[PDB]
Amino acid sequence: FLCTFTFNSNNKEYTFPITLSSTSNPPHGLPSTLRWFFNLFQLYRGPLDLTIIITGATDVDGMAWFTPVGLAVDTPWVEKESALQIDYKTALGAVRFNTRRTGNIQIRLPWYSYLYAVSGALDGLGDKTDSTFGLVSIQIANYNHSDEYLSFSCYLSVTEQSEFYFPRAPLNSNAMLST
Amino acid sequence: DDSGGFSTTVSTEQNVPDPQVGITTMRMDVSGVQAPVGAITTIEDPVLAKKVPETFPELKPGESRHTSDHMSIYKFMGRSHFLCTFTFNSNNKEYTFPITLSSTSNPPHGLPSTLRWFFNLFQLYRGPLDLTIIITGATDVDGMAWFTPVGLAVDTPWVEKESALQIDYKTALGAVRFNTRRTGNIQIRLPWYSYLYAVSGALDGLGDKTDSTFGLVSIQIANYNHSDEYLSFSCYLSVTEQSEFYFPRAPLNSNAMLST
Amino acid sequence: VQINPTPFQQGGLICAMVPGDQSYGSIASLTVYPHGLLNCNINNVVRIKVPFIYTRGAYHFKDPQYPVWELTIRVWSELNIGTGTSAYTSLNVLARFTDLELHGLTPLST
Amino acid sequence: EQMIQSVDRTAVTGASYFTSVDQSSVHTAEVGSHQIEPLKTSVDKPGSKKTQ
Amino acid sequence: EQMIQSVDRTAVTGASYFTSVDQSSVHTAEVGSHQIEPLKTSVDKPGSKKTQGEKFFLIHSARWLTTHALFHEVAKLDVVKLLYNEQFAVQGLLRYHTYARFGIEIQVQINPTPFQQGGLICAMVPGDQSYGSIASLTVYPHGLLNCNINNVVRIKVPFIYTRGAYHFKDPQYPVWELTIRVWSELNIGTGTSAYTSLNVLARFTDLELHGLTPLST
Amino acid sequence: MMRNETRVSTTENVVNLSNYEDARAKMSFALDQEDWKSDPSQGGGIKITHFTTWTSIPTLAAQFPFNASDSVGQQIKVIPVDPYFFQMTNTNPDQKCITALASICQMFCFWRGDLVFDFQVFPTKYHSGRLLFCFVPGNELIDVTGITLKQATTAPCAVMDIAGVQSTLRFRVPWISDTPYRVNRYTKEAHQKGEYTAIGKLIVYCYNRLTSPSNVAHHVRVNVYLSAINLECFAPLYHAMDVTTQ
Amino acid sequence: MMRNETRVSTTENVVNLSNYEDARAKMSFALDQEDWKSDPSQGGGIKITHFTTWTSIPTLAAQFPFNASDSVGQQIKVIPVDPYFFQMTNTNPDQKCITALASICQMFCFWRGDLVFDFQVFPTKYHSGRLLFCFVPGNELIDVTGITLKQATTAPCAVMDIAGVQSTLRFRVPWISDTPYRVNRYTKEAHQKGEYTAIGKLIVYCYNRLTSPSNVAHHVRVNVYLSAINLECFAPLYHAMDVTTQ
Amino acid sequence: MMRNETRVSTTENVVNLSNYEDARAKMSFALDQEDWKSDPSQGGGIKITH
């Protein structure tokens, strides 16, 4: 498990980062096992597999796109109307799904970084840059709120092309949170 | 020379395409321990401008750590890029938009964003394209699409109006027929049918209206009851491996690249 | 293309062969097209050789669709002189066909 | 000692009847090359002295 | 016909990173030649990168006391940041170069008298300690200073970091953090000295240096 | 009895636009699903399979005058070393003139490589002087305007003479970085420490003054070109790169 | 445990009518899904696998009289050179008589090839005279009616004699174009420069007058046939080609 | 005539999160569906597979 969120209105966007930092406390951050695992070791380098699962309202088309770090992106962990062009969005590559037909998606996230790896345990300045893997965003349109709620959920897994380096000490029992 | 031309000077080709690969690889040091003979040159002379530039000592920069080469054209532009979007406001209507590589056309009617950028990099384009249309909003809507080469009869482009043509003339050009209940998306290759060698993207005036149009994709929808919500379409172009790009031009100035 | 600057002048030129029209794209980037750089210090002569680039089989002369080539000469860096140096340079252009083919004999006088 | 290349100043070019004697000259810049068509737009014989 | 020689105008000279492009240039004039001495004025090895930059340095000097509780942090060190200083001869190499990648070797020294008792763990922690358990420090490269057994620990570690090299002027985050915890408290009888002195010696291994630069800071 | 059967996996009827493996067509309008042979004929035999066609053609990024009034050691022009740099603009028609390297590298997130600055002076044979082109490795926000001339000979530099038979000095900047790549940040709004586009700044001094007789122009304009070698860029995006004023 | 599984791609249950790869049947009404063997029996052994069957059979496109009153150099009939040309009509029954070449080539967007005009005079043995059939390469909207006879011998031409043992002169028009194809524009409404159907116009003059005794007809009618060789057409469409009046 | 055909089995479009055989990705955002080579460089040669 990674996160869950709900659109309350039509034509809105939501952007959450994949942030291995432990300074981030859930609901914004890594919870449960992920928060645990990415703190076992110092460095992480490689692709990831991501699956999003859709609940509630049907007949809803939506687009998702992956934004590497440093590039322009909307305020994370926040639901707000899009600030960007449909042209800038589709250039990063995008799936376009409909919640009538699929109800789930599984898609691999590339490793695009100007960094060697992305460390999970860091503080202060280095924590804001080096600890962010990338920002998955989701935009939905044609959501008529006469319908019921629309819930999303995200689940991360690790490919065989990921690599883990230099084991650290595991987290104390007061630093492992849950969602 | 065959044409009868003579000269003492050595005639040497200029701006050869694809000098190097756009991925870091090895195919020791690059330059060093000798001299930077390559650091002084006359850029006006095309024989001396092909001298490999080298200034300081440097090392070979290893191998790039991902497989694919993102600076290839058939990879970069293989990703399908935005083209247009439009919405039917009423039942039993048709809509026809051309694929027009001309830059005189300013979006929403024209090529936006990257396509407007890419088709202005080079002079000539020859070959098939892949086209994908994506449907939003209303469901239980059957619709037909058909591709019309240039010069043949077609309805007024970039305009939503009731059909002027027979169902027989439409289906003869070939047509998909889809239902927005079942699919919600389509991906279909567009043939290269032209009385022209290629279709140039940068042209003006008279030659701009004919030579710059690849072809006109049309979409007709029926059984749209507007008690329902909006019906949105969107189109995304990509380039096959049978397309060919010729004679690089100068890229567009920052005031000529628009967005949608 | 031929200029004749005296060594007491200074400046440059780019002379590029542009198919069709220049259209929009950048003036800075003319070095993409087949070109040559006329420099008052170095060369007073440039030469360019280009094949047939066009969207059709041949260029119909009576009712030409659009011009096959456009030659454009831009001031690449301005001309500068002291006092008394001649205030200009003359510029001339010599063009010819290579590998010329011809089709369609025809009585049409125009 | 190494030799650093430089422009060859004096050259003589021309075609058929014409000639160019330049002091400042420089090498000519080709692009592309002459191509043959796989599909002929005009099948008739290309014009020449003997046709016209 | 005979050829009369003349100056060769255009030439390109230089050394390391620098270059000279001269139109009017002329051949260089040597005198003498490099000589070797039959009798060496200085017998020590001639200085180089490995003699200056890689030697041992006194980083931090602290004291471990009986009033430090368990898991007390005797000394917290940012190792590389302390190696970048006017005092240490490695500076003159680092002050003029932008980026460096390198190893690290730590030597930590206590001096308990046999009438004292206690322990220490000295661990190399990349980045920051962050959160994770103090009990688990044995995961990191470490050594256990025991008043009974060893008064000397040694540690050798490669370059672990999220980038290519550690930029010294504006460092992103510290590459290594050395932490010294009281692993079991110091205990004495009556009259035994109430403390121990603690010192740290750090140096670079396999030091590389890039980016010469005029920036003084 | 037919036992051929399968199970519908996840992502049923989702459109992945991101790659030509999942973006290729599932059908055609072409009768008999036919293929097109190659036809170089009218195209001059110039076929473009790769974007390195446009990044090796040196184009005019910037231009600065070299005055006779510059005392020894004065910075005439400072360039950040990134493919995204062009200062050239035009008046009529209204446009922002973008180089070839900047126009390709604006479409990619990350860039690395060697950037080859081609400097071209436009002197007469009767001018004389020397320029010093210094490369100062760092981010592009480091404040370099306090560096005197003697201090800048520490950094990798090159000195060209104005009047000679060769006009151009090609300054090839080696790749100097702490990260395997740099990033296109101009999409993002404000600055973030640790995230940088350029690999440094390129300072130009007046090494010796400009001397010249009375009847020749008192200054020499200098074009600055830009190109790239050993270039690697990836992670496509879309951005319209704005003119960089010093 | 059954791990056979697949993912449903895009275009789920869309019907591509455009090609027999996607238009072929997915099932049958035929019991045991049986196949039919060939049976030439009652069909005369004539099997048609290709549309070039109909384009090589020369058919009557047009007809014009050759009067004894035509002065030397007068244009009797002008033909555009395109497969789409027929002027023949009938009265009872009401119909527009379409050739074989025009009836196949009306269904295709683009056509190229050689068009073979077969001229057949219907003289007696006692008539005499000569015709000049001139081909004037260009579009079909060029205005050719001002060309005298001496000027038209510039263009490729042929001269046939009226009275002989052979009736027909076959005028084979080489393909002369600036584009690899021409286009069926008659679907579109008005004219557009650059988009042309014909490759030129075919002028017919009176080279020598028509001489003949008193008791023989004073004119000679001339059929004009039309066919095609080296023909290539493609891009199917549907159009009903209307009679072309001069 | 196309006789290729199959029958849709049970568990149509259910997501099994429990194993990397059914949790692996069905597509990618990576252009040309590219793969990443190994890079021990800055990690000290310490790789954790277990």
Q: DSSP secondary structure string, E34-55?
A: ----SS-S--SPPP-HHHHTTS
* DSSP code per residue over B68-131: S-TTBHHHHTTS-EEEEEEEE-SSSEEEEEEEE--SSSPTTSS--HHHHHHTTTEEEEES-EEE
> Which residues have a Cβ under 8 Å from the Cβ of E127 and sit 6 or more positions away?
A42, A119, A121, A122, A123, A126, E173, E174, E175, E177
Query: How far is Cα F127 from Cα F125, in angstroms, rounded to an integer?
Result: 6
Could you report how far apart the first and last alpha carbons of chain C are, in Å? Answer: 31
Query: How far is Cα F140 from Cα F147, in angstroms, rounded to an integer?
Result: 15
Query: How far is Cα F209 from Cα B234, in angstroms, rounded to an integer?
Result: 62
* DSSP code per residue over G113-131: EEEEEEEEEE--TT-EEEE
Query: How far is Cα B67 from Cα B65, in angstroms, rounded to an integer?
Result: 7
Q: What is the three-class DSSP state of H16? A: coil
C-alpha R_g of chain C: 18
Of F95, F103, F63, F94, residue with least CA distance to F204? F63
Tokens of E54: 């890689």
Query: How far is Cα G150 from Cα G168, in angstroms, rounded to an integer?
Result: 24
Map tokens 């455009």 to a residue: G18
Query: How far is Cα G196 from Cα G82, in angstroms, rounded to an integer?
Result: 10
User: Which stretches of E61-203 are DSSP H helices?
Assistant: 79-83, 91-94
**DSSP count for chain H of H helices, then E strands:** 1, 1
B-C CB pairs within 8 A amount to: 103
Domain ranges of chain F: 1-246
Q: What is the three-class DSSP state of E196? A: strand
* Cβ neighbours around D45 below 10 Å, total: 11
Query: E163 to chain H nearest CA, in Å?
Result: 7
Q: Are strands G168-173 and G59-67 parallel, antiparallel or unpaired?
A: unpaired
Which residue of chain H comes nearest to E161, CA vs CA? H42
Residues in chain F closer than 8 A to C51 (CB atoms): 44-45
Query: B186 to chain C nearest CA, in Å?
Result: 31
> Which residues have a Cβ under 8 Å from the Cβ of E54 and sit 6 or more positions away?
E90, E203, E204, E205, E207
G180/D41 CB distance under 8 A: yes
Query: How far is Cα E170 from Cα E179, in angstroms, rounded to an integer?
Result: 23
Q: Which residues of B115-132 are buried (b: 16+ CB within 10 A; e: fewer)?
A: bbbbbbbbbbbbbbbbbb
DSSP single-letter state for residue F149: H
Tokens of G152: 């038209």
Query: How far is Cα G13 from Cα A101, in angstroms, rounded to an integer?
Result: 13
C49 within 8 A of D13, measured Cβ to Cβ = no
Q: How would you classify residue D50: left for phi > 0, otherwise alpha for psi between -120 and 50, otherwise beta?
A: alpha
Query: How far is Cα C64 from Cα C53, in angstroms, rounded to an integer?
Result: 15
> Which residues have a Cβ under 8 Å from the Cβ of E42 and sit 6 or more positions away?
none
Considering only CB atoms, C23 lies closest to which of B15, B204, B211, namely: B204
Of A71, A66, A49, residue with least CA distance to A136? A66
Of G152, G150, G159, G173, residue with least CA distance to G226? G173
> Across the strands, what pairs with E181?
E73, E121
Resolution, in Å, please?
A: 3.4
What is the helix (H) or strand (E) element at residue F223, kind and residue range? strand F219-236
User: Which residue in A130, A132, A165 has the most chain E C-beta atoms within 10 A of its own C-beta, making it the best mutation to test that interface?
Assistant: A130
Strand order in the sheet with G15-16: B159-161, B93-100, B213-222, B142-148, B176-179, G15-16
Secondary structure in 3-state letters for D3-51: CCCCCCCCEEEEECCCCEEECCCCCCEECCCCCCCCCCCCCCCCCCCCC
What is the helix (H) or strand (E) element at residue B185, kind and residue range? strand B185-190
Considering only CB atoms, B190 lies closest to which of F29, F43, F54, namely: F29
* Cβ neighbours around E3 below 10 Å, total: 5
Residues in chain E closer than 8 A to F161 (CB atoms): 21-24
Q: Which amino acid is at F246?
A: Q
Of B105, B98, B51, B40, residue with least CA distance to B260? B105
F-H CB pairs within 8 A amount to: 52
* DSSP code per residue over chain A: --EEEEE-SSSEEEEEEEE--SSSPTTSS--HHHHHHTTTEEEEES-EEEEEEEEE--S-EEEEEEE-TTS--PPTTEEE---S-HHHHHHT--EEEETTT-SEEEEEEP---SSS---SS--HHHHHHHTEEEEEEEEEE---TTS--EEEEEEEEE-SS-EEEEE-PPPPTTS----
A57 within 8 A of A149, measured Cβ to Cβ = yes
* DSSP code per residue over chain G: ----EE---SSTT-EE-S-HHHHS-S--SSGGG-------GGGTT----STHHHHSS-EEEEEEEEETTPPTT---EEEE-STT----EETTTTEE---HHHHHHTTEEEEEEEEEEEEEEE--TT-EEEEEEEEEES-SSS--TT--HHHHTSS-EEEEESSSS--EEEEEEPP--SSS-EE--TTSSS--TT--S-SEEEEEEEEEEEE--SSS-SEEEEEEEEEEEEEEEEEE----PPP---
Residues in chain E closer than 8 A to D5 (CB atoms): none
Handedness of CA B247, B253, B256, B257 (dihedral sign): positive
Handedness of CA E162, E164, E168, E170 (dihedral sign): negative
B200 within 8 A of B124, measured Cβ to Cβ = yes
Please report, for residues E74, E80, E107, E138, the alpha-carbon distance to residue E198 in angstroms, rounded to integers and kept in the order given.
Answer: 9, 19, 11, 20
Q: What are phi and psi of B39, to 5 degrees?
A: -95, 0
Of F141, F177, F176, residue with least CA distance to A114? F177
Query: How far is Cα E181 from Cα E179, in angstroms, rounded to an integer?
Result: 6
Residues in chain H closer than 8 A to A108 (CB atoms): 25, 27-30
CATH (one of 3.30.70.260, 1.10.357.10, 2.60.120.20, 2.30.30.280) for G1-246? 2.60.120.20
Handedness of CA B159, B165, B171, B177 (dihedral sign): positive
Of B108, B114, B82, B102, residue with least CA distance to C24? B102
Residues in chain B closer than 8 A to C98 (CB atoms): 1-3, 5
Of D36, B121, D22, residue with least CA distance to C52? D36
Touching D (3+ Cβ pairs <8 A), the chains are B, C, E, F, G
Of E108, E100, E106, E48, residue with least CA distance to E79? E106
Query: B151 to chain E nearest CA, in Å?
Result: 58
Tokens of G62: 């047009």
Query: F84 to chain A nearest CA, in Å?
Result: 15
Considering only CB atoms, A68 lies closest to which of F12, F235, F238, namely: F235
Query: How far is Cα G62 from Cα G79, in angstroms, rounded to an integer?
Result: 9
Q: How far is CA G88 from the centre of its chain?
A: 13
> Which residues have a Cβ under 8 Å from the Cβ of E194 and sit 6 or more positions away?
E65, E66, E188
Q: What is the three-class DSSP state of B35? A: coil
B243 within 8 A of F24, measured Cβ to Cβ = no
What is the helix (H) or strand (E) element at residue E13, kind and residue range? strand E11-13
Which residue of chain G comes nearest to H13, CA vs CA? G7
* Cβ neighbours around E27 below 10 Å, total: 9
Residues 130-159 of G with CB under 8 A from D: 156
Q: How would you classify residue F101: left for phi > 0, otherwise alpha for psi between -120 and 50, otherwise beta?
A: alpha
Q: Which residues of D7-29 are buried (b: 16+ CB within 10 A; e: fewer)?
A: beeebebebeeeeeebebbbbbb
Q: Which residues of B189-198 are buried (b: 16+ CB within 10 A; e: fewer)?
A: bbbbbbbbbb
* Cβ neighbours around B5 below 10 Å, total: 16
B39 within 8 A of B53, measured Cβ to Cβ = yes
Touching G (3+ Cβ pairs <8 A), the chains are B, C, D, F, H
**Residues making up chain H, counted from first to last:** 50
What is the helix (H) or strand (E) element at residue C17, kind and residue range? strand C10-19
Tokens of E113: 């008298």
Q: What are phi and psi of H33, to 5 degrees?
A: 50, 45
Map tokens 């048709």 to a residue: B94
Which residue of chain B comes nearest to F100, CA vs CA? B251
B35/E12 CB distance under 8 A: yes
Query: How far is Cα E181 from Cα E120, in angstroms, rounded to an integer?
Result: 6
Query: D19 to chain G nearest CA, in Å?
Result: 34
> Which residues have a Cβ under 8 Å from the Cβ of E34 and sit 6 or more positions away?
none
C-alpha R_g of chain H: 19
What is the helix (H) or strand (E) element at residue B218, kind and residue range? strand B213-222
F137/E96 CB distance under 8 A: no
G175/D40 CB distance under 8 A: yes
Query: How far is Cα F29 from Cα B172, in angstroms, rounded to an integer?
Result: 11
H31/B66 CB distance under 8 A: no
Spell out the domains of chain B, with CATH numbers in brackets: 1-260 (2.60.120.20)
Q: What is the three-class DSSP state of E154? A: strand
Q: What are phi and psi of B141, to 5 degrees?
A: -115, 115
Of A159, A153, A161, A121, residue with least CA distance to A136? A153
Q: Which amino acid is at E43?
A: V
Considering only CB atoms, D44 lies closest to which of G174, G179, G180, namely: G174
**Residues making up chain D, counted from first to last:** 52
Query: How far is Cα B49 from Cα B46, in angstroms, rounded to an integer?
Result: 5
> Which residues have a Cβ under 8 Å from the Cβ of C96 and sit 6 or more positions away?
B3, B5, D15
H10 within 8 A of A89, measured Cβ to Cβ = no
Q: Using beta carbons and an 8 Å cutoff, which residues of G are at the interface with B?
A: 10-19, 107, 109-110, 179-185, 187-189, 192-195, 234-239
CATH, domain range E1-217: 2.60.120.20
Q: Which amino acid is at E44?
A: D
Which residue of chain G comes nearest to D39, CA vs CA? G180
Q: How many CA atoms lie within 13 A of H37 on its CB side?
A: 10
Considering only CB atoms, F179 lies closest to which of A72, A90, A114, namely: A114
> Which residues have a Cβ under 8 Å from the Cβ of F7 and sit 6 or more positions away?
G2, G4, G5, G6, H8, H9, H10, H11, H12
C-alpha R_g of chain F: 25
> Which residues have a Cβ under 8 Å from the Cβ of A111 and sit 6 or more positions away?
A45, A46, A47, B66, H36
Of H38, A43, A172, residue with least CA distance to E175? A43
Domain ranges of chain E: 1-217
Which residue of chain B comes nearest to A161, CA vs CA? B66
Residues in chain G closer than 8 A to C62 (CB atoms): 138
Q: Which amino acid is at F44?
A: G
Map tokens 């440094």 to a residue: F200
Query: How far is Cα A29 from Cα A20, in angstroms, rounded to an integer?
Result: 8
H36/B70 CB distance under 8 A: no
Residues in chain D closer than 8 A to E12 (CB atoms): 4
Residues in chain H closer than 8 A to F16 (CB atoms): 27-29
Strands, DSSP E only, in F68-213? 77-80, 89-90, 95-96, 108-122, 128-137, 157-161, 168-173, 182-183, 200-211
F4 within 8 A of H6, measured Cβ to Cβ = yes
> Across the strands, what pairs with B215?
B99
Query: How far is Cα A25 from Cα A17, in angstroms, rounded to an integer?
Result: 13
Q: What is the three-class DSSP state of F21? A: helix
Of B246, B245, B243, B235, residue with least CA distance to B147? B235
User: Which residue in D9, D31, D36, D41 has the most chain B C-beta atoms within 10 A of its own C-beta, making it the best mutation to test that interface?
Assistant: D31
Query: How far is Cα F117 from Cα B41, in angstroms, rounded to an integer?
Result: 12
Map tokens 């009047």 to a residue: F163
What is the helix (H) or strand (E) element at residue E105, kind and residue range? strand E97-110
Query: How far is Cα E101 from Cα E96, in angstroms, rounded to an integer?
Result: 15
**DSSP count for chain F of H helices, then E strands:** 4, 13
Q: How far is CA A63 from the centre of its chain?
A: 14
A-E CB pairs within 8 A amount to: 76
Query: A29 to chain H nearest CA, in Å?
Result: 21
Map tokens 């005439």 to a residue: F76
Considering only CB atoms, A43 lies closest to which of E137, E162, E172, namely: E162
DSSP single-letter state for residue E138: G
Of E170, E168, E79, E153, residue with least CA distance to E109? E153
Q: How far is CA F237 from the centre of its chain?
A: 17
